[PDB]
Amino acid sequence: KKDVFVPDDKEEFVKATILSREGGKVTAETEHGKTVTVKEDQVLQQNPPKFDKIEDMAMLTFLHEPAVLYNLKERYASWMIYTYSGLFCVTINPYKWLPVYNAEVVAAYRGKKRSEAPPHIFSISDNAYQYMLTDRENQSILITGESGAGKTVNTKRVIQYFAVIAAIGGKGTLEDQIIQANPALEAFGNAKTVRNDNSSRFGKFIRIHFGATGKLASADIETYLLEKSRVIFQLKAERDYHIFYQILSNKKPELLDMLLITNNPYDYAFISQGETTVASIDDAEELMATDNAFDVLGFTTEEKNSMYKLTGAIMHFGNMKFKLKEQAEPDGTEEADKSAYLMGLNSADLLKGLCHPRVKVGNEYVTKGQNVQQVVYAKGALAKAVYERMFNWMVTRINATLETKQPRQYFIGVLDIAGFEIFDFNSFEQLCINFTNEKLQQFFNHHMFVLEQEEYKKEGIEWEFIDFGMDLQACIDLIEKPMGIMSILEEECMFPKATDMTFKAKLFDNHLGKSSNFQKPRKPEAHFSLIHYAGTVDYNIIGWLQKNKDPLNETVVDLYKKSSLKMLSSLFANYAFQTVSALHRENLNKLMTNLRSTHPHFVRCIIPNETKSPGVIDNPLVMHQLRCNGVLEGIRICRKGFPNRILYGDFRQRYRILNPAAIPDIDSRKGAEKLLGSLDIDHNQYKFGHTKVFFKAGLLGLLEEMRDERL
């Protein structure tokens, strides 16, 4: 009828009222008072007022782009930040504290079925918990979104839910320790970028282990590729890792005296290239939270002091000056003395190793010369290696405490990756980050559209394959397959004559005008652009070969191994071959095969605007996120297909109480048929497969309401 949506240049779609029709064209008055003429096929129907702010968009009469965008916008305007989209959930960043995560709320969500409670991260957490115990299988909570969308907040809320549930049924309980793992990792692995004041600069997969009846038993954390480069480098509107500024806050004066540092971040080259303060962050308060987290995780005084000392030694390492008399020599030794003292090394030995590294000639050696540029590069590389290895030690140390030896049967794994991002300058680390996001989107596409339809086919369910246009194989292959971007980088690696420009020429010769997703770029200079699922990203390739090989001055690595500071010697103990991109690809492939053995639960976080503004929706930004995430198609397959299915044996066991008189039937399929036929249900909402009974969206929920009533 008259109530419609029409396309708009600024807001994507607006509400309108049809005034007239003629020659395949429609004349309509918009909500913003504009009288518009558009083609008939561009006109989409508004859902009835009874579907306003609906909790599950799979139940809408009209399913289209503005129906979804407006339903989400209307819910958001009422601070209802979660919405169901078929079997998965969508969430929109509120950018403000809401009273939706308290203990009375966690208690009320316990054991609630999806429909009898509003959409929430606690209900996603609870539903995964109910499938885990009923099916006896591992679960995964996969939280997607761009940098700043709310992945980390939603991850911390999943952890909070299970720890508070366990609280009802080192220097703290397991529950208290799982909660403290995030503050500790965040001080060292998170930082202020343009898109997020607390950007996660590493990915993580947290496994929460449970016993047979659901008691919280243990936890483990796996982290992925930390952005090492931030330790020594910052762009204009960004900060180094939180920890540097947390220490400098002077909230612990003993720390400043122990690290031989001043209170000013601008006195330290490595950490003051961009911004040093953030309005939303109290670094003094954050230092306390970090220090307390180490205590709760049972770190010793010696373990905490060593992490502090190494952080402080990295600060002094950046202040080491070199000059000429092409051979470099130290331009002072004060900063070198401070570093060596904190690192349990000899100052004069360290400077000698930096200016004159050795090249191995069998069981003999030849001294190599270093210009100032070579020394400052090597000094930067060592600082990054100390930091990343210290970060890895901390993860290992947290895992030792989280390991209880209490009984385990299943887990719920929560994945919180570094989000898709676009800066003014995008380097190797942005490619690594964006590639992970593309892979995570393809895992969603494969589960929702490929495996789903293949399941119907192998089960003998009458089905016509639907091409949903959700397939990222072309861009993924461009980055990861042989002769792709990383394969070319890896091959240009271990070529003594290779340079950034030979690497660039090989990229261009193989893919420019040949690979659809590879383009020439358009403000800092860029070398190539990549058409990712979430946008076109301009990449600068300077330093990628050195970043991928990751060479270290092995003369000073040897000194690290002989350090009187136990932590430093342990960090470089096993030091000895794979490139960082080859290891990243390997770890990513391993993650994806492991996730395939779990029941996934997708949570799609959406950033509402670019200005951290609470309650304001940037319509093209929100629509773009919904489009590249496959939200509409994900809902279509839930409406069109059979989202629920149960093995005949499990079906007759669980739903016999619904009508025991109907099955007083040896064969479970015969049993399932007669049981279902005897019930007051639409006998078209279910289909019989070879091994499972398939259900239309909503029938499982109804069967479950009916069972909860008989119990």
Ligand SMILES: Nc1ncnc2c1ncn2[C@@H]1O[C@H](COP(=O)(O)OP(=O)(O)O)[C@@H](O)[C@H]1O
């Ligand atoms: N559901 C939420 N409730 C309140 N604030 C939130 C929520 N989600 C995100 N935020 C805010 O947005 C910021 C960025 O979110 P975050 O989880 O760090 O993003 P991501 O990990 O996806 O990059 C947070 O620091 C917080 O201020």
Ligand SMILES: CC(C)n1c(=O)cc(N[C@@H](C)c2ccccc2)[nH]c1=O
């Ligand atoms: C999402 C889907 C493939 N699915 C189901 O559609 C039903 C499952 N099991 C039944 C037995 C169940 C009923 C009520 C609560 C938990 C599990 N498992 C499933 O994984």
Ligand code: BEF
């Ligand atoms: F910046 Be968020 F951690 F993706």
Ligand SMILES: [Mg+2]
């Ligand atoms: Mg994060």
